[PDB]
Amino acid sequence: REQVKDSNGNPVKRGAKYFIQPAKSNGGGLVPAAINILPFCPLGITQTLLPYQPGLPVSFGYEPVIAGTDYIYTSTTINIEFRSEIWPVCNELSKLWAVDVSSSAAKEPAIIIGGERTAPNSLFKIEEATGAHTYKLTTSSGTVGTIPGPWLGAPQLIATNDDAKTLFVKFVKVD
Amino acid sequence: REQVKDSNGNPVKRGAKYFIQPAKSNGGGLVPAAINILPFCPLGITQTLLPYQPGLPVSFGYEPVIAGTDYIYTSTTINIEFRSEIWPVCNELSKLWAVDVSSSAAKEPAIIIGGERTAPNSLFKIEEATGAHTYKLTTSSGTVGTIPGPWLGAPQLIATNDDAKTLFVKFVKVD
Amino acid sequence: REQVKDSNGNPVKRGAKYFIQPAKSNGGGLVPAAINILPFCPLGITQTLLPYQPGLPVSFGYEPVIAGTDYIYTSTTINIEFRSEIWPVCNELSKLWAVDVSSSAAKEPAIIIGGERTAPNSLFKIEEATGAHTYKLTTSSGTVGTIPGPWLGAPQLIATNDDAKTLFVKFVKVD
Amino acid sequence: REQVKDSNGNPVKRGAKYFIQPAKSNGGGLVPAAINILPFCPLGITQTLLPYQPGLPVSFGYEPVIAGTDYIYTSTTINIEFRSEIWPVCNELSKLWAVDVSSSAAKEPAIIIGGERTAPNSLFKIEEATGAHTYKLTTSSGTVGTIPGPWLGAPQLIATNDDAKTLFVKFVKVD
Numbered sequence: 085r086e087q088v089k090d091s092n093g094n095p096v097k098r099g100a101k102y103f104i105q106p107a108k109s110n111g112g113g114l115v116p117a118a119i120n121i122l123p124f125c126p127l128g129i130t131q132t133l134l135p136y137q138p139g140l141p142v143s144f145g146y147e148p149v150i151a152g153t154d155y156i157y158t159s160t161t162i163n164i165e166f167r168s169e170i171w172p173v174c175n176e177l178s179k180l181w182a183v184d185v186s187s188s189a190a191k192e193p194a195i196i197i198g199g200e201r202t203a204p205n206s207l208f209k210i211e212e213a214t215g216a217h218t219y220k221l222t223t224s225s226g227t228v229g230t231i232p233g234p235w236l237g238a239p240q241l242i243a244t245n246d247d248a249k250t251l252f253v254k255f256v257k258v259d
Numbered sequence: 260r261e262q263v264k265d266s267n268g269n270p271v272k273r274g275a276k277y278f279i280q281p282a283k284s285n286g287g288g289l290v291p292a293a294i295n296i297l298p299f300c301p302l303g304i305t306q307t308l309l310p311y312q313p314g315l316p317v318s319f320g321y322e323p324v325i326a327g328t329d330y331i332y333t334s335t336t337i338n339i340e341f342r343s344e345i346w347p348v349c350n351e352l353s354k355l356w357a358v359d360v361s362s363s364a365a366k367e368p369a370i371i372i373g374g375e376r377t378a379p380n381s382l383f384k385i386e387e388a389t390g391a392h393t394y395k396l397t398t399s400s401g402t403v404g405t406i407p408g409p410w411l412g413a414p415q416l417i418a419t420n421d422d423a424k425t426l427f428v429k430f431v432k433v434d
Numbered sequence: 435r436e437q438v439k440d441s442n443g444n445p446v447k448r449g450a451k452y453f454i455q456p457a458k459s460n461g462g463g464l465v466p467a468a469i470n471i472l473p474f475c476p477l478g479i480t481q482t483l484l485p486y487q488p489g490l491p492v493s494f495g496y497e498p499v500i501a502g503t504d505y506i507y508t509s510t511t512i513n514i515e516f517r518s519e520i521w522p523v524c525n526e527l528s529k530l531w532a533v534d535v536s537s538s539a540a541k542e543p544a545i546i547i548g549g550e551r552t553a554p555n556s557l558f559k560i561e562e563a564t565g566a567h568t569y570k571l572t573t574s575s576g577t578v579g580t581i582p583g584p585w586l587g588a589p590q591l592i593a594t595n596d597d598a599k600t601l602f603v604k605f606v607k608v609d
Numbered sequence: 610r611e612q613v614k615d616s617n618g619n620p621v622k623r624g625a626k627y628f629i630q631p632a633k634s635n636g637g638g639l640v641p642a643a644i645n646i647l648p649f650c651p652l653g654i655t656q657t658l659l660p661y662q663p664g665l666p667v668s669f670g671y672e673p674v675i676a677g678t679d680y681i682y683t684s685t686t687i688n689i690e691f692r693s694e695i696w697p698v699c700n701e702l703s704k705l706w707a708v709d710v711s712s713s714a715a716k717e718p719a720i721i722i723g724g725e726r727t728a729p730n731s732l733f734k735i736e737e738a739t740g741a742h743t744y745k746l747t748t749s750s751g752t753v754g755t756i757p758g759p760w761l762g763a764p765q766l767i768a769t770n771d772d773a774k775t776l777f778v779k780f781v782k783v784d
């Protein structure tokens with residue numbers, strides 16, 4: 085396991101703010117977005133198609149434990165949380181990424197917003213991918229990938245074990 | 260072929276306005292509704308969950324042809340069009356029901372709003388079912404049925420060969 | 435004070451279901467609708483422009499008191515409440531009509547959905563208007579009238595003391 | 610007239626892409642946003658409340674005329690256009706900023722999206738303010754200012770002669 089690095093080569097700091105930006109793409113960062121109409125909670129996660137939109141920042145925290153370091157390592161379980169002062173819907177749910185485990189979850193389940201910090205579906209690992217400062221995210225339900233989503237076909241995050249669907253990302257420090 | 264009858268026993272007249280109401284249901288009539296987020300045209304068709312809502316009016320017209328008669332007969336191809344002065348979106352498409360034949364069409368294709376009068380996918384038949392006063396609609400892609408749709412699970416219309424999904428309806432003359 | 439009558443001449447029953455339908459109009463009954471974008475709660479009340487839409491039913495209950503009668507009388511304070519099994523937004527607020535008394539209320543304040551049963555802003559009286567089975571509604575902030583609202587200019591309910599803005603209605607028993 | 614300068618001291622070039630960002634603000638750049646519900650075209654312009662969102666790019670072009678120079682000068686009439694491949698609504702109107710001159714225009718009219726290049730209401734000037742690198746925009750209806758708008762109070766652009774409402778901005782060169 086190695087220090088995960090941001091897009092400028094510096095190791096990623098626990099609790100600090102990063103945009104997640106899909107490598108080698110015309111569109112922008114990852115953002116919350118409704119994936120169902122009504123009810124529209126929990127929200128899904130999509131890549132915006134808009135080129136200079138950087139994403140909504142997130143920060144990473146270890147779970148469990150790791151009373152050692154202010155730095156994020158690969159292959160080690162974290163929670164991923166959106167960081168926003170404003171959050172005008174879905175307020176009874178958290179901002180933690182989580183894999184949909186509801187009774188309507190799809191065979192490749194959507195990644196939603198609203199996990200509980202300790203529940204197994206909220207745990208991710210960051211792993212090295214082939215590509216400088218390029219990574220992938222995994223979960224116990226599969227690797228994070230995409231399919232075309234409901235907003236003009238923008239990529240929507242799901243968990244999948246189809247290798248051709250993996251989402252490759254880099255982490256861009258919020259400055 | 261028999262004369263199709265409205266919910267008061269009278270023959271259904273070509274060009275007059277009817278609500279299409281699902282038989283044996285605590286919900287209301289059939290209404291346009293978005294089935295996709297963006298783009299949201301073409302519109303789909305959904306049964307409203309609200310009990311007192313009668314649906315949006317439609318009318319029926321022979322296609323092709325038929326100049327013998329004022330009435331609508333079973334087993335005979337017609338167009339079905341919503342009738343509404345107010346139509347604030349998807350103005351580039353008609354108000355004619357049609358089966359989705361677009362490149363993204365599901366295996367059980369949605370019934371969408373926007374057909375061309377002579378197009379094959381715009382032709383329906385009315386057929387008798389058991390009782391009442393009760394009918395079904397058929398197209399060359401299958402019988403009109405429903406699945407749970409994006410508006411709190413409200414039934415959404417589709418063309419299907421699954422007999423368990425048949426939507427049984429009555430036609431309520433508009434005042 | 436007199437028994438208020440429905441559109442079919444029968445006195446109005448406490449707790450029973452009625453559509454409120456503006457007299458002498460091309461459009462339909464009164465319905466909840468968002469009057470602001472975000473936040474969209476509390477909901478406003480508009481007249482739908484769609485001709486055969488009857489409104490969302492309401493029922494009237496005395497407040498205070500009146501331990502006497504199953505019948506609604508003029509000039510006597512009631513609450514007005516929307517009656518719907520389904521209510522998919524604004525759930526932390528009631529379905530009682532009320533006059534907006536928030537810090538952003540307009541000089542002619544909107545009628546909103548969400549009053550508290552005993553608060554003074556949730557109290558209405560039904561009064562006779564010139565017209566058979568025609569009434570108006572009043573509140574301590576003024577008579578219920580309309581202005582053009584945000585949905586294609588559909589009439590939105592407000593409280594006003596401008597006599598030219600009064601909304602004249604009839605009560606149509608839900609059958 | 611002076612050469613207008615971007616937030617890095619370089620002269621602003623006609624036709625190149627800039628974000629317009631409000632000076633001294635915890636919110637982001639300027640973006641199209643619906644200001645009316647239905648119809649929702651034309652779009653208005655709002656400052657986003659989200660801190661890391663840079664706004665949607667614009668570019669500037671002389672109108673009329675001026676073929677001496679590549680750069681944008683103060684005190685000189687230009688068009689301002691949003692620049693975006695993705696434009697999923699209001700396609701019947703341009704991406705040009707304009708002052709609302711429609712029959713429903715407020716006393717301090719909204720700045721809307723959809724002007725005609727030669728139309729008077731589509732002409733702006735850039736003027737210096739105090740520091741930085743800081744400017745304002747003016748039109749023949751007044752200076753561009755803001756009021757709290759329909760998206761959680763986010764500032765919405767309008768033309769005004771109220772000096773207390775002046776929006777002070779910098780121009781951030783798009784990468």
Ligand code: 68G
Pocket residue numbers: 115116117118121124127130131132133134137139140168170171172173235236238293295296297299659697
């Ligand atoms: C429900 C709540 C949400 C959506 C519907 C939606 C939804 C979305 C969508 C609109 C976009 C991501 C997809 C995309 O790239 O779109 C690209 C941009 C467009 C397609 C053009 C503008 C779309 C407008 C804003 C929506 C019009 C609503 C239509 C008319 C309603 C149709 C309803 C039918 C059922 C009839 C988006 C984005 C987006 N969202 Mg979103 N998002 C949310 C929720 C949140 C939310 C709580 C947050 C934290 C403040 C949040 C953040 C956020 C950020 C930072 C960003 C982006 O940069 C965005 O990519 C962006 O482009 O915004 C313009 N979102 N969020």
Ligand code: 68G
Pocket residue numbers: 118120121122124290291292293296299302305306307308309312314315343345346347348410411413484487522
């Ligand atoms: C886009 C355009 C459309 C929808 C999104 C939509 C959509 C819909 C839906 C709302 C309903 C059918 C489903 C139902 O039973 O719901 C029942 C009632 C509700 C679910 C509660 C009210 C929902 C409100 C009105 C909309 C809120 C939208 C949310 C906040 C957007 C968030 C989106 C996320 C992605 C962020 C409906 C109906 C409905 N429609 Mg619809 N419909 C259209 C389009 C039309 C249209 C052109 C017409 C001809 C005038 C038209 C008519 C029409 C009629 C007559 C009726 C009904 O009686 C309805 O069943 C009804 O209950 O209206 C309240 N519609 N139409």
Ligand code: 68G
Pocket residue numbers: 309347465466467468471474477480481482483484487489490518520521522523585586588643645646647649
């Ligand atoms: C937020 C929640 C709501 C709206 C936005 C909205 C809103 C509304 C509106 C849509 C209509 C009343 C005004 C009217 O006559 O419209 C007439 C019909 C149209 C203009 C065409 C269809 C409009 C579609 C459904 C909405 C598209 C959403 C657009 C694309 C979003 C634009 C967002 C911008 C910011 C970018 C309406 C009606 C309406 N509502 Mg509404 N209503 C609600 C809320 C409720 C609600 C909780 C209930 C109890 C189930 C409820 C009931 C209800 C009933 C029974 C009825 C009607 O009969 C309605 O008049 C009707 O025509 O529905 C189609 N509504 N409700």
Ligand code: 68G
Pocket residue numbers: 134137172468470471472474640641642643646649652655656657658659662664665693695696697698760761763
């Ligand atoms: C209709 C079309 C539009 C809106 C409703 C709307 C609307 C808006 C709003 C949402 C924001 C600006 C205000 C803001 O800061 O909000 C900040 C973030 C939020 C308030 C949370 C997310 C709200 C979600 C995305 C929409 C939910 C709609 C509700 C559920 C509808 C209920 C309606 C009731 C009547 C029933 C916004 C932005 C926004 N827009 Mg917008 N915008 C448009 C149109 C466009 C448009 C054509 C473009 C060119 C691609 C476009 C771009 C654009 C960009 C780049 C950005 C931003 O960065 C934004 O500030 C942003 O934060 O996006 C999330 N927009 N655009």
